């Protein structure tokens, strides 16, 4: 419950940072190399961005603890507010060093994100992002059709894990026609 939520929030934070870097949602200049799960990552040093991500995940946490999250999705949006890429983490919490084990498995997802630009086309200039949470001060709103609908998605599998406390699949849906 709490263990899984903590591990996942910490992983999701690193993964969101890394997605924002490899998809060029923010300038490379704000990111610093760091190491997480024993693998190289890139983390934003900009305090407002970082606080945004943190606040988002702090809100997700209690839902994870109660196993109410089906998916967490990092959505990259073009200047027109059209979803062009979605990184979908589908999450299931199933019914001696389990943390070291699970972290080595999470490392695999990080590794796959870090190279996903090999399988995706460039994004258009001026993209932004949001996070969508699919359920089973920092106010959340129901998503609209605009935030979600993506015409002609191509699904690109990135990684799947199974463990005693967590099963998770990460895939990307890329809009087939980004436009530029």
């Amino acid at each position: 419950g709490q263990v899984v939520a903590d591990v996942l929030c910490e992983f999701l934070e690193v993964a969101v940072h890394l997605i924002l870097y490899v998809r060029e949602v923010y300038p490379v200049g704000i990111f610093q190399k760091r190491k997480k799960y024993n693998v190289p990552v890139q983390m934003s040093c900009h305090p407002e961005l970082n606080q945004y991500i943190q606040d988002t995940l702090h809100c997700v946490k209690p839902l994870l603890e109660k196993n109410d999250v089906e998916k967490v999705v990092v959505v990259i949006l073009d200047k027109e507010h059209r979803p062009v890429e979605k990184f979908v983490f589908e999450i299931t919490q199933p019914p001696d060093s389990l943390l070291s084990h699970v972290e080595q498995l999470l490392a695999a997802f990080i590794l796959k994100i870090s190279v996903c630009d090999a399988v995706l086309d460039h994004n258009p200039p001026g993209c932004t992002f949001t996070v969508l949470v699919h359920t089973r001060d920092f106010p959340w709103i129901l998503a609209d059709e605009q935030d979600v609908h993506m015409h002609d998605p191509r699904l690109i599998p990135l990684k799947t894990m199974t463990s005693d406390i967590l099963k998770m699949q990460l895939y990307v849906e890329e809009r087939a026609h980004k436009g530029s």
Partner: peptide, 21 residues
């Protein structure tokens, strides 16, 4: 659809970030 939530506030724009750099 009924069980998809997003933050009401947006992240800072890239432009906004670039303004500080």
């Amino acid at each position: 659809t009924a069980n998809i939530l997003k933050p009401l506030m947006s992240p800072p724009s890239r432009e906004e970030i670039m303004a500080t750099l």
